[PDB]
């Protein structure tokens, strides 16, 4: 409703760097808000893509941002009559970014890994990896829970049980208020998907450079399965956290699995022990139901609600014809211990191939009426196909069926305006929560400032 579409702020990274592929707000130890920006194809030292991260100080004029530096050198360790190897080329550092406290977590889902023992090997595979930084102090740490030292032959004998070689950890990421990092790894367990959790504090305290393979005892990983319903389900393609069991001491996980059950798709709610509390099945195969998930209480009852995006949903139209437009589902949490029922509201895109629902950002309470609101991206929507971000306001009965405001992309075609979103943070300290929108195709980020309601 009251985002300002006239005076935007533009940040920009290097050409081709995909600057803005991922972003988040970051607050330093003094509460000063900045913007962490992921640029997963930024060039490294060897003039090869390795990805990069940028920490953008707030400025109404925007402009260039300083780098948040990470080690981009490939590593090798000869230990235990084996040879450990990391490969950072095309690893895609900044394919996801998230801030918690005064710490930044930037991941490279496609960082590769291999272990050599004489003539045998573990195989060179994308275990993924996350880099952690405390910008003020300069502290650095890493977390790569899927790295193993088991040789290829062994996995074959045991029929590829507990095979974490293609995890792509960090593909998605989130951090609980308590400071537990939760990584989505859609390729875990031979492409079933897994989740890796570990306290940020313990990551830092247990990490030392050069070790490459080390234990994080307080970590917790999800489980493998022989149920074919999970096969090629990419469980962890997206991830979020919230309160869904009524016990405020426990933190529940929300996991997207957009190809679950032969591409039906699913989203599951779990306790911190990865035990399943609910499952939402997709409505239409190949819609990618679970591509994006969002948790926020939209109807002001203090119970977290669930939004799910299916960006490839094909709406039914006259003459038995289907039209790919994308869809968003709203699930309101019922009072007390009860299952999430059917969706309370269906929001469906309008522009063909628009991919409405590709991203869903809680905005907090934008217009300050007591109800939290959301923004939905259609990265190729709008009459021009350039992209659109639509705002839907909370209300007592859920969300409004029509948007209160539409943001047309200011960038050229192919920018992917809206592919990444982040809201619910007041960056200019004016008392209204603001929205940052990534457009990695244009290597830029747009900042929309909320203003008093007119």
């Amino acid at each position: 409703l009251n985002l300002d579409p006239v005076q935007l702020t533009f940040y920009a990274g290097p050409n081709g760097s995909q600057f803005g592929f991922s972003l988040d707000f970051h607050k330093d130890s003094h509460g000063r808000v900045a913007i962490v920006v992921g640029a997963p194809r930024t060039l490294g030292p060897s003039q090869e893509e390795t990805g990069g991260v940028f920490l953008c100080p707030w400025r109404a004029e925007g402009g260039q941002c300083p780098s948040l530096l990470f080690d981009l050198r490939d590593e090798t360790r000869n230990v235990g009559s084996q040879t450990l190897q990391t490969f950072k080329a095309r690893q895609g550092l900044g394919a996801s970014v998230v801030s918690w406290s005064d710490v930044i977590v930037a991941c490279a889902p496609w960082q590769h890994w291999n272990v050599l023992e004489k003539t045998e090997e573990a195989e060179k595979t994308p275990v993924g990896s996350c880099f952690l930084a405390q910008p003020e102090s300069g502290r650095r740490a890493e977390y790569s829970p899927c790295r193993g030292n088991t040789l290829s032959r062994i996995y074959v004998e045991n029929d590829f049980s507990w095979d974490k070689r293609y995890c792509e950890a960090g593909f998605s990421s989130v951090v609980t208020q308590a400071g537990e990092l939760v990584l989505g790894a859609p390729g875990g367990y031979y492409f079933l998907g897994l989740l890796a959790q570990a306290p940020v504090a313990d990551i830092f305290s247990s990490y030392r450079p050069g070790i490459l393979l080390w234990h994080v005892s307080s970590q917790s990983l999800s489980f493998d399965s022989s149920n074919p319903e999970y096969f090629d389900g990419y469980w962890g393609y997206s991830v979020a956290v919230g309160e869904f069991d009524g016990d405020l001491n426990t933190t529940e996980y929300v996991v997207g699995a957009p190809t679950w059950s032969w591409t039906l798709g699913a989203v599951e709610i779990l306790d911190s022990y990865y035990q399943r509390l609910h499952r939402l099945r997709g409505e239409q195969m190949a819609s990618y139901f679970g591509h994006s998930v969002a948790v926020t209480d939209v109807n002001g009852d203090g119970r977290h609600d669930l939004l799910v995006g299916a960006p490839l949903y094909m709406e039914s139209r006259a003459d038995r014809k289907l039209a790919e437009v994308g869809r968003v589902y709203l699930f309101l949490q019922p009072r007390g211990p009860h299952a999430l029922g059917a969706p309370s509201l269906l929001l469906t895109g309008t522009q063909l191939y628009g991919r409405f629902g590709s991203a869903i950002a809680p905005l907090g309470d934008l217009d300050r009426d007591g109800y939290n609101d959301i923004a939905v991206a259609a990265p190729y929507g709008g009459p021009s196909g350039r992209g659109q971000v639509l705002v839907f306001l909370g209300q007592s009965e859920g969300l409004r069926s029509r948007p209160s405001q539409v943001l047309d992309s200011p960038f050229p075609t192919g920018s992917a305006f809206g592919f990444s979103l982040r809201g619910a943070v007041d960056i200019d300290d004016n008392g209204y929560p603001d929205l940052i929108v990534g457009a990695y195709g244009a290597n830029q980020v747009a900042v929309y400032r909320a203003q008093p309601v007119v």
Partner: antibody
Amino acid sequence: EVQLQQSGAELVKPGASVKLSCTASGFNIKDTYVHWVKQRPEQGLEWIGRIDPANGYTKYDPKFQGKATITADTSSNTAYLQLSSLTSEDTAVYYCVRPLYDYYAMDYWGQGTSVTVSS
Amino acid sequence: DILMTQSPSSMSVSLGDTVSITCHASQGISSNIGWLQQKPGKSFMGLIYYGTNLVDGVPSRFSGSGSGADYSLTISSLDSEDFADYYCVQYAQLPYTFGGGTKLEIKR
């Protein structure tokens, strides 16, 4: 807190066999490698082998191939070291070891199990 | 196998002294070395891992260093409890092998 609680001292005869145990306290045995080390006053410290209790795969110093047999039961959260065809030279103190962070390190040690072979 | 030559076999020193134990390998092990402490008539305690990294709970007066095939353990300002046996151990290759050992004794 991490503690490795081994069995009590053994007093056996030559030619017989014995099975030492290493119970994990404050953690799951399945988390890391478990090694076994032999200590004698003259010969000093010697690495026997290791096991990965998660899957049961083991490695041995070829000097102990035959006598030493390392096993593990995740149920009782314990690792074992079996010695066979015992000799006067098998008279030693036996420690079970695990790493702290580094996968390959030797950081946490049990109190040690004394073994004496005699007729 | 990798031979670990630890020197000296023993040293007579006093409280507050800064002493250094060395450990020479038969080949490069690239800091894949650990240091251990065994107090008289007791079990072992990890001091250092990967050449220079302190085990959790170890005082900072302890410190490891070196590279290639030559490494050192240093104890600044000896404490009354530091008088004990010390061993190095490499894990660059299986089988793991240990140093001869070094005993810190009270001088008089």
